[PDB]
Amino acid sequence: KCPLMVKVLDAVRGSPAINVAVHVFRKAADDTWEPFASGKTSESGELHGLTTEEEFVEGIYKVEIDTKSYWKALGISPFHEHAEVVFTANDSGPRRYTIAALLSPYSYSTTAVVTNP
Amino acid sequence: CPLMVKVLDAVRGSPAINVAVHVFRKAADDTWEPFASGKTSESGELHGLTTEEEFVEGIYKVEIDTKSYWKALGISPFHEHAEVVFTANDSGPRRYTIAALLSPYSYSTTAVVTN
Amino acid sequence: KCPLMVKVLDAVRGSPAINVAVHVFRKAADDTWEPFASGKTSESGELHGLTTEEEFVEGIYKVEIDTKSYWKALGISPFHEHAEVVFTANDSGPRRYTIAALLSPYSYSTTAVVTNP
Amino acid sequence: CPLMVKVLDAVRGSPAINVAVHVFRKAADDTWEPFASGKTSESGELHGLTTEEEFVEGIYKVEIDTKSYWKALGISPFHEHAEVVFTANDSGPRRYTIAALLSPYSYSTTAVVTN
Ligand SMILES: C[C@]12CC[C@@H]3c4ccc(O)cc4CC[C@H]3[C@@H]1C[C@@H](Br)[C@@H]2O
Numbered sequence: 420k421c422p423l424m425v426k427v428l429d430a431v432r433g434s435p436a437i438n439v440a441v442h443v444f445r446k447a448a449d450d451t452w453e454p455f456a457s458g459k460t461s462e463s464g465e466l467h468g469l470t471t472e473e474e475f476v477e478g479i480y481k482v483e484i485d486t487k488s489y490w491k492a493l494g495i496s497p498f499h500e501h502a503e504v505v506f507t508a509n510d511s512g513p514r515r516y517t518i519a520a521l522l523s524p525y526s527y528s529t530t531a532v533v534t535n536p
Numbered sequence: 537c538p539l540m541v542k543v544l545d546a547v548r549g550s551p552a553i554n555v556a557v558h559v560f561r562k563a564a565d566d567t568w569e570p571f572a573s574g575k576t577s578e579s580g581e582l583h584g585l586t587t588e589e590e591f592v593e594g595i596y597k598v599e600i601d602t603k604s605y606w607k608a609l610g611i612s613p614f615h616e617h618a619e620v621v622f623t624a625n626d627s628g629p630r631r632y633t634i635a636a637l638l639s640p641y642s643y644s645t646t647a648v649v650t651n
Numbered sequence: 652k653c654p655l656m657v658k659v660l661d662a663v664r665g666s667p668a669i670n671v672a673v674h675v676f677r678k679a680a681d682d683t684w685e686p687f688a689s690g691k692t693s694e695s696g697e698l699h700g701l702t703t704e705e706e707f708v709e710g711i712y713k714v715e716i717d718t719k720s721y722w723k724a725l726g727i728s729p730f731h732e733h734a735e736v737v738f739t740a741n742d743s744g745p746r747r748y749t750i751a752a753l754l755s756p757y758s759y760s761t762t763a764v765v766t767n768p
Numbered sequence: 769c770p771l772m773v774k775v776l777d778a779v780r781g782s783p784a785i786n787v788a789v790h791v792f793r794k795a796a797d798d799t800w801e802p803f804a805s806g807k808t809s810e811s812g813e814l815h816g817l818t819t820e821e822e823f824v825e826g827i828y829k830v831e832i833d834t835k836s837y838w839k840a841l842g843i844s845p846f847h848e849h850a851e852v853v854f855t856a857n858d859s860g861p862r863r864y865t866i867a868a869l870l871s872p873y874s875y876s877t878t879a880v881v882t883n
């Protein structure tokens with residue numbers, strides 16, 4: 420909801436990827452990754468409510484999507500540990516970010532849709 | 537040499553082997569005329585479809601028969617085939633590689649155009 | 652709306668692809684492509700209302716997305732004429748189909764999300 | 769031979785040339801230890817990163833420095849880099865090709881694992 424949303428789809432089943440764990444980190448002043456927010460995708464493959472416009476300040480963020488556990492639960496041993504998405508946010512003022520990922524066992528893609536509010 | 541097709545399997549992390557590929561050229565009456573065809577190799581590649589002489593400017597379609605590939609693997613697919621439609625242009629680079637990455641409910645295709 | 656929706660995104664701009672022409676065809680009994688529906692994507696990159704559950708019977712359908720005109724209007728000469736999506740629909744009863752496409756000048760992807768109503 | 773990286777540019781339909789690539793291996797203290805690196809060739813490829821001897825089972829990360837690539841082209845990009853994280857497994861095929869297809873606001877990566 421509002422400034423950061425994550426959407427995950429399954430390219431094998433043509434479906435939302437449900438119950439996928441997502442961890443967001445923010446680079447701290449000492450160049451370490453600090454925990455920022457986390458959650459799981461819903462029945463629609465979406466994860467809303469990770470942060471607020473106030474909390475989501477300028478910075479470098481990493482969205483980890485735990486794809487390996489997703490595939491393993493479906494009986495599949497996939498190639499990747501997780502899909503990582505690393506980006507600078509809000510450098511030119513607040514924006515609305517949708518981070519999308521499309522998953523296959525040995526491949527994925529990831530796409531950002533960015534809107535000006 | 538001027539046209540190659542390369543196909544990968546995103547589920548198995550492998551070349552997509554034995555996939556039928558049909559190339560067509562658009563005729564003056566806007567129908568698709570068979571132009572060349574073959575099956576992908578053990579490396580997922582299909583070479584020797586055409587020649588510099590035959591591959592003149594025009595509109596081409598490459599059909600990759602993905603449904604039969606997934607059916608052989610016992611995996612239910614969405615698409616009948618992947619279609620790639622483009623105009624060949626002499627002003628650009630001399631070689632077209634039409635690549636495709638296949639999943640049961642999604643495909644990605646790219647053109648790598650080089651000299 | 653209801654059983655067939657098309658969504659188009661621009662991978663260069665990280666935005667919906669707006670005002671993209673979309674033509675849907677259905678294979679007739681004489682194995683020819685008959686016009687079925689058409690429209691343009693909205694400001695959200697979506698195209699709703701192409702058909703109804705009544706009209707969208709079993710068959711083989713082709714969704715043509717006119718990507719070349721889209722890129723040309725942005726000053727770009729792209730590789731493909733259009734993105735084609737060809738599929739059998741409703742073979743096992745009515746379903747809800749979202750046909751998504753992600754566009755770049757020399758590449759695209761397309762993905763179906765299929766739901767049981 | 770056991771690890772290759774191949775990078776393509778979806779905007780220009782070309783190999784992505786001169787892209788920095790850094791490989792890391794996960795250490796016992798869960799930090800990332802520099803393992804190998806290089807720049808993609810004129811064919812968008814990076815060979816000779818490691819050896820059969822050195823490429824033991826473990827968790828590896830391949831970072832592809834996409835932001836600097838797009839910046840050089842004058843195109844505003846979204847990601848800092850593309851990351852690819854995986855466990856090397858001796859039970860599987862002997863060669864890993866890590867491929868990536870780049871756009872300014874989207875990337876796709878595949879592992880092609882072969883003998
Ligand atoms: C990058 C790629 C996967 C890797 C492919 C590949 C893999 C190994 C290799 O030796 C060559 C290629 C060329 C096509 C490449 C695909 C084009 C696009 Br459709 C796909 O994302």
Ligand SMILES: C[C@]12CC[C@@H]3c4ccc(O)cc4CC[C@H]3[C@@H]1C[C@@H](Br)[C@@H]2O
Binds near residue numbers: 426529532751752
């Ligand atoms: C995952 C996706 C980008 C995000 C798209 C998206 C974005 C926002 C949203 O609300 C829905 C979708 C569904 C299609 C999704 C695409 C399908 C495939 Br063609 C592409 O990789």
